[PDB]
């Protein structure tokens, strides 16, 4: 027989799964700054340039985090 | 609705009155860094950078009278509420922030715009400024959340372990007289070790959490301090 | 009254390869093995050289990346393109490896492994071992242990082949 | 549940209740009594501090025209999500 | 047939999944301080400067965890 | 038809998921001390200073695990 | 319609999830000892101070594993 | 309505999850022995003390594995 | 899935073993024995997981 | 999924093999044998997971 | 999901290859052959994972 | 999810590429070509996963 079911509460699961994507973003940021500290000690005369590149890398990772949050919020509401 | 209640410090207040009617030196401070902000000589600050010392000391005393003594069974942490800690941290953090903002020096915020002129202003630097301005408030929230969660989790774990220990000690000690006494002795020794370990961990964690609580506020203050060089 | 620097009289300088340059395929490593301001080998083409630095053993072939190695008392192997082997023993020093295809191994002492005697090496260890037992103080024991490490390396080096 | 019940204040002594209307009216009476005398002119900063902000807030409340319904602040039951009344 | 179902305990699952994102944030922080400790021993004279960058990474790394923590509350309390 | 269902036992599942966050935290803490040992062997003169920075990092990393553990208690006791 | 359901065996599922939290704890402890050997090998005279710090790191990591284990046993008996 | 359900196949699922934690233990063992070999090469004179410490690390890591394994067997037979 | 870590753990042992052998080729025998020891310990956990899988498969 | 921890472990062995070979390349013939040994053990673990993947897929 | 481990393992091999080749470029040929060998092994595990997928998707 | 182990593997390759170019800055071309090769193989694995994803998505 043809049965159609509409579960209201399944968007919570999808929202949670999308939020898990941030674990990679958080770890990636930690890796970026972990190397930044090592690099600065190695060649402290280039602290500013390394800091600028680290910020760029953080921005790109943060952008991915924004995309994941966009999906999470969309499913949470829609 | 008006509820009348009392804190659990009355005996401690009595002891403070008894033992501090006469002066005594203090040489050990949980957060000593509030007294030594400048480490290079000839550097001085025109801002009241030592204003936090009194509040720091009082907060340490209050939170230590509550948290450290809470390890004693049935001792109550009367202030243990999420929004009350939020109010406390709001007071301190926002008061210092408004002290910096009332200075009406906008250049003080120039460092919020992260990066150099090479980076695109709209698509990189502005977003970073947005994130940092968000991160200040997030630091406040994280401070209060951490302080709440540490106590809550530690005391939940202590209560559960104590319940288990009471159960096994009361309802299975007869095994000492039985042929399986060795198992009970092993379990009892493990429980004693766990008891000692948990108490030591909680004792250390309370002090460390207070240290971090004060360090977050001091970091807020230091992020906007500027030091002049004597000539 | 300006005086010449002592390096002006030396006409064999070190050639470094500019980083922004094309690569070359090299089949020979120019080795310079030196002892106490005396070269045992000079820009001598060798196929490979094996050296024991503090971290471990390095096998240097042509084109090896720029690196500086702090040697330890140990054997050093030099293999020519003929496939023939020449084995020395060093007591210490440094090895500078250049990406241009040169290796300057400067040692305080570099002696062919043939010259060393295993019988002499064994009895000497025994003598220092007795002193280490009666060595007066911590410093004396450390010095004695330095000798034993070199001796055991020599003994082990000769027992290998 | 039971472990969660251990995190409560242990020295509760008395609870008092009062309607918002009643004590707001009493406060207004007190404010009128203290701001009524002639020796406090209406143009004084104290009088304006007392009155202007309250007047502004009440005017903002009166002007409010919201398309949604705001349930009564002091209902008997505010725990049921599907019953705003 | 059209059937609508509302499962009223699913928000627990979504909350737990979002909480899992904190593992990456915790790991990234540990990586940052691990690099800090192994970097100070190399260039101690710049210890203080490294510490400031290490905190910056923590500030930019803990924030991500809040988003996941924020979603937990938005679903736990709804 | 409109059917509303309330499953009680789901709160256990969400509680267990939050505990997974401790895997990253526990690992992250071990990473800090691993670097501490590898750093004290590279510059033992700073062992006391490094030990201080390691403890600070432990608490920040530990703090995150508590956030997850709080959610576990909330759902486990509700 | 209002339907209340009580699923019994779910507590087994939640308990298993908490056990996964011991994966990082076990890995974290192994990481500390691995770093300890290198530090001892690279600085053999400090065979005790490093050992003490390794024990301290294990204790903290063990504590995290025990926090999760309390939930694992608690849900198993709920 | 009040409905009580008892699923008799969910004591298997929890058991499988508890076994997953063994991976975090088994990998931890490899890490200790992965770095033990390097330490022995670096300082062959300490082939004994390092081995004893590695055994201590393996035992403690295995202790975590057996704590998880206890939950695995309890739910398998109950 | 428990085998994923066990298999990976073995790779780590046989990964560092090569580095240790290349650094100190004179100690291949002792390093090789320790590598076997580590493999046996990891395999023990692998059997524990394998035991559980089979029991839940034929039960 | 257990294969993920096996295939990755294999790559780890070879990755360290290259570095070990590139450190002292005269021992390649010896290291390669040990590298094969590691692949022979991790692959054996993958068989156990594969066995279950087949038993449950045909039963 | 097993492809995640395979893909990562392949990248790990090449990552070490670049480091090894930079260290001793003269051995690029020998290292490249060994790197391909490792890929041929990791990809083989991927075939099993794909086979199971195609043996259950079309079933 | 298999793409997670692909993107990470790609990042691993390029991360090592930068170090290799730093250690041996004159050998950039050979490293770049080998890195591209590793990316292609890893991307091929991802495409296989995408193939299955679309097959099930449209099934
Ligand atoms: C209707 C029923 C009755 C109730 C009516 C209430 C009306 C309410 C109106 C509406 C209010 C709305 C808002 C309420 C918000 C409440 C919030 C709240 O509670 O927060 C928790 C919070 C808890 O704070 P905490 O951390 O516990 O510390 C506060 C403590 O007081 C401790 O802090 P501390 O130690 O820092 O304080 C300083 C302390 C410093 O230390 C001391 O001084 C030591 C003493 C401490 C006393 C205070 C502690 C009280 C302990 C419990 C009670 C003691 C026993 C009482 C016995 C009662 C028997 C029935 O000094 C004092 O306390 C100064 C007073 C000393 C009095 C000494 C009197 C000596 C008399 C001697 C007579 C001798 C006669 C001889 C004749 C001989 C003839 C021959 O409370 C407060 O902060 C204070 C809230 C007060 C709000 C205002 C309420 C209005 C005033 C009501 C007065 C009623 C008087 C009539 C009563 C008659 C008997 C029934
Ligand atoms: C700076 C570090 C400080 C470390 C201090 C270390 C103290 C060591 C204490 C050793 C054990 C003491 C046992 C006491 C027993 C008391 C009687 C009893 O039954 O208690 C059982 C109680 C509970 O035991 P229980 O849980 O077994 O009780 C069973 C009871 N039933 C079955 C009914 C539930 O013991 C305790 O709670 C003792 C815990 C002590 C933890 C340490 C607290 C330190 C912080 C407070 C310091 C206060 C100093 C104040 C000085 C003045 C300040 C101005």
Swiss-Prot record, chain B:
Coiled coil: none annotated. One of its GO terms (biological process) is proton transmembrane transport. It is a multi-pass membrane protein. One of its GO terms (cellular component) is proton-transporting ATP synthase complex. It comes from the Eukaryota. Its main location: mitochondrion. Keywords: ATP synthesis, CF(0), Hydrogen ion transport, Ion transport, Membrane, Mitochondrion, Mitochondrion inner membrane, Transmembrane, Transmembrane helix, Transport. It is found in: Mitochondrion inner membrane. The chain crosses the membrane at residues 25-45, 46-66, 84-104, 118-138, 144-164, 178-201, 208-230. The keyword Mitochondrion applies. F-type ATPases have 2 components, CF(1) - the catalytic core - and CF(0) - the membrane proton channel. CF(1) has five subunits: alpha(3), beta(3), gamma(1), delta(1), epsilon(1). CF(0) has three main subunits: a, b and c. Mitochondrial membrane ATP synthase (F(1)F(0) ATP synthase or Complex V) produces ATP from ADP in the presence of a proton gradient across the membrane which is generated by electron transport complexes of the respiratory chain. F-type ATPases consist of two structural domains, F(1) - containing the extramembraneous catalytic core and F(0) - containing the membrane proton channel, linked together by a central stalk and a peripheral stalk. During catalysis, ATP synthesis in the catalytic domain of F(1) is coupled via a rotary mechanism of the central stalk subunits to proton translocation. Belongs to the ATPase A chain family. This is ATP synthase subunit a. The lineage of its organism: Eukaryota, Discoba, Euglenozoa, Kinetoplastea, Metakinetoplastina.
